[PDB]
Structures are given as C-alpha cells and as structure tokens.
Amino acid sequence: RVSSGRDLNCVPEIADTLGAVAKQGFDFLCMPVFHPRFKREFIQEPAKNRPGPQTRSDLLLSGRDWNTLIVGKLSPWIRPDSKVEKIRRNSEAAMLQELNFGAYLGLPAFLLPLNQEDNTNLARVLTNHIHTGHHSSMFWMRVPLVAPEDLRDDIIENAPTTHTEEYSGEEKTWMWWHNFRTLCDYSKRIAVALEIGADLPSNHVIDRWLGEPIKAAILPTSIFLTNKKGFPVLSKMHQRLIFRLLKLEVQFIITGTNHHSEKEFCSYLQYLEYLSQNRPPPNAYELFAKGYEDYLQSPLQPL
Amino acid sequence: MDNLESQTYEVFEKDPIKYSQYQQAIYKCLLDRVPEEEKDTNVQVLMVLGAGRGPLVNASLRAAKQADRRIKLYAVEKNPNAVVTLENWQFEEWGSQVTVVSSDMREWVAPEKADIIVSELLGSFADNELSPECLDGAQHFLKDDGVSIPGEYTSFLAPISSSKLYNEVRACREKDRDPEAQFEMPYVVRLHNFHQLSAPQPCFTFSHPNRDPMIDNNRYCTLEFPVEVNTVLHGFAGYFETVLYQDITLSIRPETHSPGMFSWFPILFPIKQPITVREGQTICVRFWRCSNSKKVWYEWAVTAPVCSAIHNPTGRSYTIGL
Amino acid sequence: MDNLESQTYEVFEKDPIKYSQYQQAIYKCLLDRVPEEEKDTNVQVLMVLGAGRGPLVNASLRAAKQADRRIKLYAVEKNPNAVVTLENWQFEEWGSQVTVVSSDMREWVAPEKADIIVSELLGSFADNELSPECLDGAQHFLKDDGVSIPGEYTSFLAPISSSKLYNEVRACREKDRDPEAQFEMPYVVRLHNFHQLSAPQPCFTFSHPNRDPMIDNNRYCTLEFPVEVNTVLHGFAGYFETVLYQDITLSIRPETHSPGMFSWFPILFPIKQPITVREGQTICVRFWRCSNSKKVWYEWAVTAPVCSAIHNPTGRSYTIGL
Amino acid sequence: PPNAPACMERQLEAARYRSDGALLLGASSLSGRCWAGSLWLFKDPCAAPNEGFCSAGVQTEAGVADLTWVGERGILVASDSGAVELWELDENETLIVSKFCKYEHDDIVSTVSVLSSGTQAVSGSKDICIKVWDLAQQVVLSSYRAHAAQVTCVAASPHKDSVFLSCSEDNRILLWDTRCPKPASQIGCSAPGYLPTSLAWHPQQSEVFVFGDENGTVSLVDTKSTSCVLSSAVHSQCVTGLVFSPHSVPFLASLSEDCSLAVLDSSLSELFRSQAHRDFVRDATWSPLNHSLLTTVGWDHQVVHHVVP
C-alpha cells in the first residue's frame, strides 16, 4: 500500500546490493551510476586520457530492472556553479556524462542536489539536456526542508547561530527550488524529493511546499526516535507530515546507515506501512473522487 | 547526432539470422585472404566500425575459430555509453586481442591500417543512416588491397496505395512547424494494410571502398512504374539489398527477403496529395540524395501521371545530421 | 552560412572613419615590425581575411605608401560573388602584389605564413559574427611572432527599459515556430525610445592570436547592475569595444563611441516577461556563449531581482551557423 | 601472501611508511563490476605495487577513502560504506584481521586522523558530521555537526588529543579544542577565498599549519597570528594532500589532480617537481630509513620513489 525505496551512496556488487534491498521489502534503489569518489578530467592531459572502463557495465541488470528499480544519483563531486573555471567546465561535462548514461540505461528518475542558493549553471546544463534528445525520464531535485547551514550545532565560538526571528530566512530552501524550476520554464520532468531533518521547521515553511510537485520524501535514519522495546518510530510532528505526504501519494526514500543496530531495515519500513494502514480511512466524497485528482476538464456547454 | 539506448541495442542483438550472416561474410573473407600455408604466420587486422556493445566483435572471434586464421581487432564506437559496455567485455573476457576506440571513425587516426572493415550502418532505405559518409571518411585507414563488409548495398522503391497510412501521416501534424511537414519525411513502418502497385525497382547503390577519384554521394534517379489497376497513389515503400561479402547478403525486399530477419522494417516516403492512377498508366517518381558539410537528405517528386510538388526542398522538413 | 549582397558591401565601404582607423592600425604596425635600415630589404607578408570587395586591401596599400615599408598581400574571401569584384580590381589596378584566394580561411592551405592578419569580422556584439572561430582556424598560418588586427575585442551589456521595443519584439511572432521564439534571439536595432538603467559592464573578451594550449571560445559571465529608479526591465542593450592595434580602437559603447561611425548599431537581447525593478535593487543577468562543431549561440537569464526562464536553451530559437 | 587478494585494484588511494620502513597501501576499485577496496603491507617497499612480493594483503567490503597507521599493528580505514574500520596486523605480520567495523556515518567516511595519544581518532564524512572515537572501547565519544557541507579533510594536532583541524566545502577551516563548550573556531585569510581541500599540521609548532585550496594554492597559517602569513600558486589544479618531511628544517610535499608532485621549503618555493604520474597523485610518505627518498601513489597504479635535493 506504500511505495518506498532505499538511498545508498555505496554499492560494491549491484547484483547482491539490489537483491538485498528487495529482500528487505523496498520497491526501488537510489544509487550512483559512476563511483561517487571517481572524479574525471575532460580537458587537461594526462588525466584526460585515463583508460576505461569509465563505470560498471549495463549488462549486470535487465532492462526491466533499469527501467523500474534504479534511480540515478549525480556524483557529489559535480559542482557546476563552482567559482573555479576548471571545476565548472569539468562538472558541466561530468553532468551531461552522468545524465546521458541515465538516459542510455532508461532510468525512470535521476536525483540532483539543491544544497546551495545559486544553481543557475546546474539548471542550464539540465535545461539543455531536457531539450537535447527525446526521453521521459524524471528529475528528482533533492531539497531539504531546512538548509544544512540552519541545522548545524551552535558550536562555532566565533560565528554563532543567529537565534533572532527569521520568517523569510527559514523559507529560503523553497526560493532555491522556485528559482531553479523557473529557469527551467516549469518543465514537467522536474519535481521535488523533499529531504526531512530531525528538527522540522515552523508550519509556515511546510505550508510553502503545498501545491509543489513532490514525487519523493527523503527520511534519514537520524530523525527516527526509539520506543520502549527497541523498534524505531517518529515524533507526533513527523507523523502529522507523513499523513499529509501520504495524501499526496509520494514515494518514501530511507537514506543513511542503521542506528537501531539490534533490528533490521524492514523495521524502519514496517513503521511507514503501520502509519499508512492506520491513517483516517477515505470518506464518502474522497472514495468517489479517487482518480479525478488534479485532472483538468474543458468547459462543456449544457445548452 | 544521437546515441542509441541500452535496451535498443539489447533487442537488435537478438536477431541471430543477421549475425549468422555477418559471421559467415568474415569466415569466407578470412579463408580467401590468408592461405592455409600462412594460417599461423599471418595475423589479419580487422576493424568493427560502429562496434556497439560488440555482437560484431564476438562474431569476428567466432569467424576466427571457424576458419582457424589469426586476427587482431579494433572496436571503434562513437556512443561512449556503449564504450562503457565494450571496455567491460574487453577487460573481463576478450583481452588484448580486442583494442577498444572511443571515437567517431571519420575522426580516429588509426595506429595501423586494416585488412577488413566490418560495419552495420545500414538503415531501412540502406544509405539513410549515412553508411556512405561514415565509411568514406574511414576508408583512408583501409589497406590498398583491403575488403569492406559490406562491399555493396542498394535501395529499392515501389509505389503503394493505402488511404489508411495516408491518415496515419496526415495526423502527424504538430503545432510550431510547417503544417505539411509530416508529408516531407520518411516513416519506418511495418506496412500491413496497403497495396503494392508495381514490382520494386532499385533507386540508389553504393560500393566500399569507393575507388572513384572525385567521391560524390549525392544522387538523382528517375523511376517508371507500370500500374495494371485503377488505384490512388499515397506513397512509396522503400527497401534494400546489401552484399556483405560474395553471395552472403541481407535483404528486406519482399521478393528476396532474408528469412526470419526482423532487424529492419520498410520505410515510407508519403506525398501531400493522393494521385489518382488508371489501369495501363505509368507512375514516374524522381528521387534526389542531397548533402551539405552538415546534413544529408532525400527530396522527391511524382512527374507522371500528374506532377506533385517537390517534397522536402532544402531538407526543410527532414534532414539526417552528419 | 550566407553571402552578403553587392549593395550591402557598397554602403559599409562608405564609412571613412572605420577605414581611416584600419589604415592607421597597419601604418603603426608596419613601422614597429621593419626598422628604417630594413625599409627596402624587408617585404612584409600581409593577409586580409574576409577581404570583401577590398576596402581593407586598398587601405593596406595606403598604409604601405604612408610608412614607405614593403608588403605582399593575400585577399582571402569565401563569398565568390565578391571574389569576382576582387579578381577584377586585381587585374585592372592592383597587379601581382595582391594575390586573390577564393576560399574560407578555416580551409585555405597557405603557400607561406603571414606577418600581419587583418579582418573586420566583428558584429554589433563583437563575437556574434563568429570572429573567434574564423581566426582560431586561420591562426596556424600566422607567423610565430605575428600580429592580428584586431588583437582584442570585448562585448558590453546594459539593462534597458522600453515598453515600445517590447511591443516591436512581441509582434515578431510568426506561424510555424515556437510562439515565444521571437524573444529568444538578439535584434540589431538603432535604440531610440528606451531607458539605460545602469552603466554598461563588459560581458565577453577575445584575444588574437590565442596562445592558450586548450583553445575554448565558450563563456559564462554573471553581471550585476545597480538600478537607481523604479522601472520595468524589457531587455539588455549590447555594444563592443575592439583594439585593432595599440591605442587605435573602434567602439559603439555610448561612453567611448568612435565619432561619426555608423557601421554598427547596438544589439538587443529581449526577455519573454518584463521584470519590475525598484530603486536600490540589483539586476543580475547571466550570459553563456555555447557551440557545437556546427553552430554557435548565446543563452541568457535574469536571476535578480526575480528569476527569468533561461532564454534560447540548446540554441533552439537562435543559432549562428559556422 | 597466505589468503590475500589475487589482484590489486587499479586506484591506489593511500600510502604510509611505518617506523620499520614497511609500506601500507590503501586501494579502491572506482570502476568495473566490483566497487571494493583492499589493504596491503610491503616489508619490501621497492616491490610495490606488485601483488606477488607483498608481506600481507586483505580485501575490504568497500573502497577506502582515507587510511592511517595506529602504532605498528593498527590500521584505521575510512570506508565508502559509512563505516570506520580498525584492522590489527598479525603476530608474525602475515595476516590482517578486522578488529572492529562500526557503521556510524550516514554517507562516505571521507577522512580519518589519529590523535597524539594513539588511543583516539577523529573521522570526517560527506554527512558533514565529525566524530571522535575510542579505539579501545570501539564507540563514538562525541559527534559534532560543525559544518554546512561535506567534510573534505580532518588533521589531529601533533601533540594534543584535545586539538585538530577540519576543512569543508562550506569554505570553513575549523580549529577544534574538545575542552571548550564551543569547540570549533573559524580561521583563515582576510578574504573569503577558494574552498579548502587539504590540511598539514607543522611537526614542531602546533603554532602553524598549511592548507591547500581547490585553485591549486598552498597557504601557511599561524593560529594566533590568525592571519595567512604566506602563500604560493604551486599547482594548476586541486591540491589533494600535504605531507611534511621528517627532516630537521622540514620540506613540504604537495599532491594535486594535475598529476604532479611538488616539494617546497619553509617559504613555499619549488625545490622538486615530478610528472612521473599520468593520473591523480593521491598520497605521499617519506622513508624514515632514508629521509631524502619520497614515495607517491596515483590512480595510474604507479608506486613511484623520488630522490629529493
């Protein structure tokens, strides 16, 4: 009843790894298409002429597996908006390389980070990629509810966390996304993978992401509290959000290592399945309207 | 101008009849180039131009075991996504025997020259996927006495009647372009509900290598079709035959169609307005192959029994990008 | 990709200030390259790249008489219609001193190497008429110690407000293309009824010859414009300065505009939607120069005070053909 | 080579000399079917990278981001798996057995450093977290999210278990001191400047250290001067590592992604430059046996030895 996958930034054997996460009860796997630490040079010899292969083979999985179970991740070293000329050009080439390889495999969706404010060059490369060739892959933009800067522990003695009232400040991750999608003239193939922190923001921020195209919600293991037995669970504030996301029919992405060491990963997932099958069951109106959700109908003259 | 998707390669790798035929075209070429007295002394340098994921490379290795003649392989591929797949086979299985080259064959500066060049660049209309332009640019690294597989291919046209396919084309009109554009381009199509009005005659032919000192891949060709019923012309079905080597051939020409081979469907050159044709009359169609430095395109026209407008002048509606 | 009409050449031949400046740029370069002690021994080999009907050739001959230094001239022109006009001047008047070459400079294999290369490939936005790509391809036949005229050019942008020019662009919508295409391309225009909202800042610069070992003519440039009134952004005016030689320069940048020179009008990069801007706020515009092997194009976007959509992604609306 | 791996992964990541003269190699597989890593001891350093003439080797679940010696038997490993691994060397120094493998980071563990005592280590990651370990107890003592971006490099002070540097993609260079209730202190030049990519504590003064930025510039910082005393444009590209020589007046070894090695005096002036590598230069250790011999490893699988004037 709940669609949910697993984020890993580490895959030794794509055969066994995908086999494991499916045996854990997941629907799909977010993973790298190139090794995240494997930087590539595209201009300067000798690094330029590095012998291949440049990544692992597409033969290791079936088309059906590539088309359904795998979600690409842009290598984290790719920074198209660097203020360094060389890193910019290399990340420009790296991104097309990574995105093109995703098209080749025919992945249903591909993950890209929004973790700073200026993504003007990241948007352009993607915009050129979307208008270059023909495909209907999806692009999940990884945006956090709360910027990593405003989530950091107040432990830098000579640069403290300004505690003051900040209304327009604590919304800023939304202007990150809004600026990005605007540059990409509201492409239907650009959507939101909404990353959730341990600390939620004020409701007024969670009110921004109303009306936005949320395909995914990224739950790190961190945010999960433990209960009396040892089961991992969530706050009543993180539950209120899960119930609102469920209404929007989004896929859930478990990221990061196991912190409830005694129990497996199908425990994190079990809880979501628990929350899901307990939610206020669908009423009279909502049962007849099921399917018509955000479906436009031209004006018909009854005369 | 665009790279093929992994799953596209996958399907076309599964046509055994096509790769049986390519295996044999080499098998017979190996034996004719290196005598039995030279079978261990002479190693043949063999280049797959457009190697893909390497079903032609594997096939060249099967041909070597069959003929028991020695060979060295280059696998030149433009699509880097495919090259990932080659370099992974190269490491795991093939080894030093197979060099891999992530390059366009028109660009690649070859370390040595080749005995045999092996490519499958043919489209449904033969030269439409630009086999001529690619091998023209890559022949200067073929040995003076070297073979091309294929050596010869020929395009074939036949007039067809299908008010069904005429609708299918008419409905391909899209906003933000010439509203007749959909008529000035060829469609690959498993022709089904149609009427072949005359026996296919050949249109264009190409030879590899190309001896002629002033190479020119542009063509003009007048074809005349006897028509022995009343009917309405809606388009022209396109097919090809190719000589891989000697008597070994692939064909989608219905008369000589290679049995069980699904790799290629027929093409279709439609016409804007359907032309009424009466028992006894001759359909006269004209076909031009045209090119810049940048793009290659077909233009075409009907001159009998009535004149059409020239389709795709300047390649305005349809060009294939070099 | 297109040849200039005779009457077009005619008008642009009649800007004396532009050809005064080119005459002098050579005059000063001649004296600096051949000492007076060498004035009869050393003959300078001088190549007009894009010679046209030869006002630059005539000007090079005037520079020689001025400096009393010896020179030999090539006049390389792609437009064969113009070449008719050169070869007729060459015969009647110039004689053996002026070689004529009916060729693209990127292609021409030069008999000898050149002291000085002289070209006027500049557009209203400097590099928009592809001066970089042409001289990049033709520099390998410039002497190791050789001069380019021009040596340097720079493009300049300034935000502008004109609801008048916004209408003129909006009305450039045409059937059979993207209905916003008219906004994703630059217009040459004698700007008149408009408001410059900030001092022009420089956008892109190019140097000739190009020393850098990995040549790359693509660019990305963030510009920030202080705006000191309330207003509505409608577009960006484009201008250029160029260093022909030393202190000799042409400019259409209103501040440093070369007096009485009508050769170039300003360019205009419009935006789809007009952006409201308030006293004190910063307009932040971004400009990319992009290229294939086939075509070169600008993309652009506004990131402050609000974001625009990226204009002309893929060069879909506007490309200049190599 | 009892047990061990048949073949060595293409990408050599780390290279550290013991006090004996023995050589430890970290290697990752950054391309191909299997994305793993491997540890190797070489009692003969002129034999490496050769897999046949090694004293001991072992295969890790996953590729190795950073390495470090922990005494003479202990090896500390920053895995892609998000784990920190301590591998203890054998009795006869023939095997390499896993002592602990703790999954505490939520992303690639990007850098490890041992603190002066050799009982404690600090791990930096892409999760942005920094952690302090008890290598005896096998647990996280402290967990500090100081940064707003993935942590590039952490470097323990020569002489204080309390103190260590970290540098991140958030442009911050931090000076730590676990004894303060606000440990971290942001430091560096007058300007913003390019991202920090590498950190080398000076051997004699906890006073001073050098950091390398991504624009191939090495800079020298004095902690109390709290100002960038000196700078030089050493590399055409990102500086990935800085290693001081064991010498009296110690030389600075400088690694980069421009596939070159630089060696600089106390004033950051070019003494030696080697282009012997044809892929990213990844690590450096100087021979304790011969102070003038220097060993580098690349992604070009070359284990190179240099004589330094």
Ligand SMILES: O=C(NC[C@H](O)CN1CCc2cc(OCc3cn[nH]c3)ccc2C1)c1ccnc(NC2CCC2)c1
């Ligand atoms: O006629 C078609 N397309 C036009 C094109 O010219 C035909 N060619 C055929 C050879 C080929 C070979 C490739 O590469 C092989 C390879 C290298 N390495 N690995 C594989 C790639 C494409 C094509 C398309 C067409 C389109 C859709 N379906 C069918 N029929 C099959 C669908 C199930 C019946 C045919």
Ligand SMILES: O=C(NC[C@H](O)CN1CCc2cc(OCc3cn[nH]c3)ccc2C1)c1ccnc(NC2CCC2)c1
């Ligand atoms: O700005 C314009 N066009 C953009 C273009 O980049 C500008 N360049 C100028 C130099 C030039 C020089 C040529 O060749 C000379 C030559 C060689 N041999 N013989 C002559 C040819 C074209 C251009 C256009 C443009 C368009 C219409 N009118 C005006 N202004 C004048 C009209 C009466 C005021 C300007």
Ligand SMILES: CSC[C@H]1O[C@@H](n2cnc3c(N)ncnc32)[C@H](O)[C@@H]1O
């Ligand atoms: C099997 S379809 C032909 C194959 O050859 C490759 N190919 C097509 N044209 C060229 C070319 N000019 N140079 C190199 N490879 C090519 C294609 O990418 C494809 O893998």
Ligand SMILES: CSC[C@H]1O[C@@H](n2cnc3c(N)ncnc32)[C@H](O)[C@@H]1O
């Ligand atoms: C005066 S406008 C520039 C002149 O140079 C010519 N020109 C432009 N580009 C080139 C080129 N690449 N090679 C030769 N001539 C050129 C044009 O046809 C025109 O006559």
